[PDB]
Design a protein around this ligand. Structure first.
Ligand SMILES: [Mg+2]
Ligand SMILES: [Mg+2]
Ligand SMILES: [Mg+2]
Lengths: 195, 129, 72, 188, 76, 149
RNA sequence: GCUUCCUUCAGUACCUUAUGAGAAAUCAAAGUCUUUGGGUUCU
RNA sequence: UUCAAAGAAUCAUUCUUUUUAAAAUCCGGAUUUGUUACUUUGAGUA
């Protein structure tokens, strides 16, 4: 949909950072005269949709954790959790969470939704020791080690991240029976955004 | 420098398999190599391959089914008599039930079983699992 | 006789103690966009995940089906 | 009066017809070229059908010397003329002989590589397309124990009514000559 | 897909099917009145037919090509 | 590279099409004549080829004329007794030797001279194995200088 | 004309990464090795 | 540097038959074609 694209543009997910990462090349449309990398955006949309579908495919929504150690994605992830069923982590990920049975805050999901495999890399790594699939709202420069789905966005720009999250949530809602198509979803972006 | 094109090609193929490629550009094609590839295809290990004709030693690119465990040359193409085969195969390939030990034989290239069926052993090119 | 699982991408076939390797499940649509009951499935071996080719493999798989449309 | 002389066989069905056509062309001076069938001859012909709704196409086996000297030079004009006259698609080829390597001819001592089977096949492929010129041969080994030669021609032919059909005809003729599957194409 | 590749003629001279990067040039000076013919990547200088003037300045790759001038590629 | 540690791959690589291109007007006879003229004028095979490529419109004498240029020279009878590359090597060697004679302490030059000698001996051997050189032909450091002409 | 940026050659280092290796130190070669044989000289 | 092609049996594969050039030989038909390594059959061995 064009509307989604427009929204994205209004935010900033079209700009990825400098440093390209060869495996991310395909998602990037082209570099600019500045020294930045513009993401193909249609790809971002399609990928996002796919991710949403995958999320939906989980039987119960509660066992699909989401994560951002970033201060300004935390809010967004909380919102996402509230709206879908999914756990958020938000902030300090504990290294034993998906392996260490006996730990208090254990909780082993069927999907892991990272916001950035650069910063939230520990979580990603953990995903390997418990066969958790991992989708990642990753940048241009990010490492895609262990991530199954890479949604190309930007993570630097908190607003953009928030927008992306919102979009994902909307998609999931659409997939489920709760908000029918043709109707736009009521809740806004800014609601997801940090402050 | 090159010496045994075929060996190099096989190594390349093996590497590709290890990585988990799909396609792979075997860089100097050779009649022998082509034959080997055909044989492999026949016994299922390889998919299609598009021997591209330049105007030189051709390139092959070959379509892989994620199925090969290893394939290899055994340089010094030892002459091998029909009685001498069994020991060689025991030495080489992982099970009597499977894998193939490819001989060039005066009845074209064929696997150890084929050779046995025929009667002629010959010089031993390579193998796969 | 447990017959092990073949990585849908690379066909490598994956043992019990692999973990790492994942069976990602993609839910279907029925005309509207609503979640159809059915689910199309891909197992992905650990090796590909480690490499980072996993995403590419997934894309290719999707293309092979109808699920997504660009290939790369 | 002539006509039988233009071919080099005992007149049979279609060869004779072709000869007659050639003679007519010579007489008339159709389109542009004149007195070019004085130079031309032929050895034999073969009519072949294809997997079609309809249509039969024609090999014209030409003595090699003649082909080298005259037919190579003016081929496009000739073929087009033939098409205009006889709606059957036509191809010229040189009757060039193939020799086994190990064999000992009275002639030569060592076969020239011109006469080798593979070389000959290549040459006939080159011949059969002639409005156009080959870009790249490429031999797909199917996993079924088949081999398909996927030939691709240049531009030029893309401005014609007969393209796909022509390609099919070419393929058929190749098959007839050398029991070889083939497929033809062009670039977008 | 290594076989049907698209935009990578920005590979080295060693592609899938090797080409040359060089090509021939239909060239004309401003007022000699003819097709002179040329090879890009020409080492020795080419003198045009009539008044023998430098048409191509020789260099370490792809001749500098004198003054304004104009060149069609030979094509095919 | 045979002798250095050089590993470069700078190369001519000819085009796929090896039947001459449409735009080539020159008939073979004319080109042959031109080649002959060039040969007479003192040019060597490679040089001749280069000249043909540049000054005249012709990429490869092999596509216009069935034969390669050395072959045609041979046919015409203006082929050198002493092959191109070999001759060049000999010349180089001679030059080196002169320098050595002049200038005795140059070690690097001496080393390189040895290398060139070795290469000559390879090339020389190869030519002997064919029939371009006679079997009675050693290369001598004393004679060498006279040989080139 | 030079300068930058892109691609590419040949050098040449470094960084992360190895369901690659290794006894480990470490190593893009010390990898493609009990899934053992590309060639070859020396020890 | 002769690649290949087609038919019959069996449980995608196995074993078999037939032809696709050129030269010499035989009454349009039918039948010989580098050397060695290697390999297969033999032979001959107390
Ligand atoms: Mg050396
Ligand atoms: Mg090299
Ligand atoms: Mg060893």
């Amino acid at each position: 949909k064009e509307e989604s694209i427009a929204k994205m543009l209004i935010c900033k997910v079209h700009i990825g950072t400098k440093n390209l990462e060869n495996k991310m090349k395909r998602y990037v449309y082209t570099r600019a005269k500045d020294g930045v990398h513009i993401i193909n955006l249609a790809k971002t949309y399609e990928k996002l949709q796919l991710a949403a579908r995958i999320i939906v495919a989980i039987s119960n929504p509660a066992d699909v954790v989401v994560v951002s150690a970033r201060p300004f994605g935390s809010r967004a992830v909380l919102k996402f959790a509230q709206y879908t069923g999914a756990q958020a982590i938000a902030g300090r990920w504990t290294p034993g969470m998906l392996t260490n049975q006996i730990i208090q805050k254990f909780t082993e999901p069927r999907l892991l939704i990272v916001t950035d495999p650069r910063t939230d890399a520990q979580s990603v790594k953990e995903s390997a020791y418990a066969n958790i699939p991992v989708i990642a709202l990753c940048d241009s420069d990010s490492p895609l080690e262990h991530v199954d789905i890479a949604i190309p966005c930007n993570n630097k720009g908190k607003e953009s991240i928030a927008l992306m999250y919102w979009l994902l949530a909307q998609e999931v809602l659409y997939l489920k029976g709760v908000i029918p198509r043709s109707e736009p979803w009521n809740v806004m972006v800014d609601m997801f955004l940090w402050r | 420098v090159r010496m045994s094109v075929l060996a190099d090609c096989l190594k390349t193929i093996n590497n590709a398999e290890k990585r988990g490629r799909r396609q792979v550009l075997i860089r100097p094609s050779s009649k022998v190599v082509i034959k080997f590839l055909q044989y492999m295809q026949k016994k299922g290990y390889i998919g299609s391959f598009e021997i591209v004709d330049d105007h030189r030693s051709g390139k092959i690119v070959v379509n892989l089914l994620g199925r090969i465990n290893k394939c290899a040359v055994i340089s010094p193409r030892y002459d091998v008599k029909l009685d001498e085969i069994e020991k060689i195969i025991t030495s080489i390939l992982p099970s009597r039930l499977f894998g193939h030990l490819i001989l060039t034989t005066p009845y074209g290239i064929m696997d150890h079983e084929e050779a046995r069926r025929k009667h002629t052993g010959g010089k031993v090119l390579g193998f796969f699992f | 006789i447990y017959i092990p699982r073949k990585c849908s991408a690379t066909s490598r076939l994956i043992p019990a103690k692999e973990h790492g390797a994942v069976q990602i499940n993609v839910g279907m649509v029925d005309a509207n966009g609503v979640y159809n009951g059915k689910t199309e499935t891909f197992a992905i071996s650990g090796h590909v995940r480690q490499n980072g080719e996993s995403d590419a493999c997934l894309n290719r798989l999707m293309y092979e089906k109808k699920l997504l449309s660009f290939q790369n | 009066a002539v006509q039988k002389r233009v071919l080099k066989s005992n007149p049979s069905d279609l060869e004779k017809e072709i000869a007659q056509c050639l003679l007519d062309i010579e007489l008339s001076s159709s389109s542009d070229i004149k007195t070019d069938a004085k130079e031309i001859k032929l050895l034999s012909c073969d009519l072949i059908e294809v997997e079609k709704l309809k249509k039969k196409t024609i090999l014209i086996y030409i003595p090699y010397k003649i082909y080298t000297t005259y037919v190579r030079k003016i081929q496009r004009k000739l073929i087009n003329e033939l098409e205009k006259k006889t709606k059957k698609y036509v191809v010229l080829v040189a009757k060039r002989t193939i020799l086994k390597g190990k064999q000992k001819n009275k002639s030569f001592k060592i076969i020239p590589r011109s006469r080798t089977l593979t070389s000959v096949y290549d040459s006939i492929l080159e011949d059969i397309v002639s409005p156009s010129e080959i870009i790249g041969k490429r031999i797909s080994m199917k996993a079924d124990g088949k081999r398909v030669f996927k030939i691709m021609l240049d531009s030029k032919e893309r401005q014609r009514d007969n393209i796909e059909e022509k390609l099919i005809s070419f393929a058929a003729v190749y098959k007839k000559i050398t029991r070889r599957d083939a497929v033809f194409s062009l670039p977008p | 897909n290594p076989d049907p590749v698209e935009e990578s003629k920005k590979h080295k001279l060693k592609r899938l099917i090797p080409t040359p990067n060089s090509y021939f040039m239909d060239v004309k000076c401003p007022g000699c009145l003819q097709i002179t013919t040329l090879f890009s990547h020409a080492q020795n200088v080419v003198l045009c037919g009539s008044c023998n003037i430098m048409l191509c300045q020789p260099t370490g790759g792809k001749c500098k090509l004198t003054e304004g001038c104009s060149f069609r590629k030979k094509i095919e | 590279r045979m002798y250095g540690k050089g590993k470069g791959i700078s190369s001519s690589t000819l085009p796929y099409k090896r039947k001459q291109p449409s735009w080539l007007k020159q008939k073979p006879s004319e080109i042959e004549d031109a080649i002959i003229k060039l040969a007479k004028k003192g040019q060597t095979p490679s040089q001749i080829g280069a000249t043909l490529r540049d000054n005249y419109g012709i990429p490869q004498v092999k596509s216009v004329t069935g034969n390669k240029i050395l072959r045609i020279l041979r046919a015409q009878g203006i082929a050198t007794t002493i092959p191109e590359d070999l001759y060049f090597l000999i010349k180089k060697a001679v030059s080196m030797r002169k320098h050595l004679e002049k200038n005795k302490k140059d070690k690097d030059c001496k080393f390189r001279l040895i290398l060139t000698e070795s290469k000559i001996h390879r090339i020389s051997r190869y030519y002997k194995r064919k029939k371009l050189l006679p079997s009675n032909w050693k290369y001598q450091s004393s004679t060498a200088s006279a040989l080139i002409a």
